[PDB]
Amino acid sequence: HSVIHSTFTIERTYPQSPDRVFHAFADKATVRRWRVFTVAEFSFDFRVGGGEVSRFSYGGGPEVRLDAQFQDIVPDQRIVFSYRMAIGPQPMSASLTTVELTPTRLTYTEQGAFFGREEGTRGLLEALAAELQKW
């Protein structure tokens, strides 16, 4: 009933190599450990035109529906995808996400439309730092 457009770019670095950094956004299993608490349906197809449907809830709460579609893929360098999140019957937002990693200095960019989200994103990267060595 009202849209707010914001673009926030957050930067974070990783002593691990770029291929590894990219691996954390490419591999199906690797992404399940850290979701990009039951999980109903879940699909992944890491290619252009490929999707990433994801239905889930927290402690019996309402279900969060995530639908993403990969727009542009540059092996070990760039990942561009759009996605929408809903928690209702209640669309939360839709955004275009760019994740670049030059040799690592991953540069996370999110151009979104909201029907705030930034701080959580810096966190999603602080977590990236987590499973960053779990191997």
Add this chain to the structure above:
Amino acid sequence: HSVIHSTFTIERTYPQSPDRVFHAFADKATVRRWRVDGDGAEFSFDFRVGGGEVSRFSYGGGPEVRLDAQFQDIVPDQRIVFSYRMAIGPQPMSASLTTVELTPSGDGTRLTYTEQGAFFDGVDSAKGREEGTRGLLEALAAEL
């Protein structure tokens, strides 16, 4: 590789009401007259969340311009959100998110068209892309 991120907005009012202008976006036939032609290459239009669009055209014998879009959100007569990627030949020039808002303007319609895009490798079509959309919206005007 490089990625340019930019956003632009275009406001344009119409003497028509929301139902009318929304329609011009949601009705395949109408759509095919102000944005695309189709009357003497390809145009799949499935207007629904999750549904998408596919357009393929070229001028003369030149490179085929392909636009692939998917609807992300639809609020009747008031909002349209879709993402899309464009390419000419095999070179993918960009991916972006589009938001179309239609707020009542007393007796007319307020249309704010916002485009958050990501232009690929060297290519900076942001300028050229806003130019065209500003034209397509002007063209829409006549269609109403």
